[PDB]
Design a protein around this nucleic acid. Sequence first.
DNA 1: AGAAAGCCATTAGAG
DNA 2: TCTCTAATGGCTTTC
Length: 57
Amino acid sequence: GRQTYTRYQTLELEKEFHFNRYLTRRRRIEIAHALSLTERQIKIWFQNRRMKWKKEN
DNA sequence: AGAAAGCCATTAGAG
DNA sequence: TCTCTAATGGCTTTC
Ligand code: NI
Ligand code: NI
């Protein structure tokens, strides 16, 4: 099964991605707690978002 | 070194 | 039926 992300979670992440397309371990834990997601989800979201940003270039 | 993070292709589920 | 993206898996890369 797959969880669906709220607007707030997706908005707060996209806002983060605006500043740096990669995350540090300290920040990655911070974000996972604030959005009530796992460290793994945050990593994966950025993997996908970086791939999505690649197709837009 | 080898754990941890990435890249990339691919899949599958939510709505 | 169709779209988008969470999630996966098998590699390579970074530290
Ligand atoms: Ni700006
Ligand atoms: Ni090695």
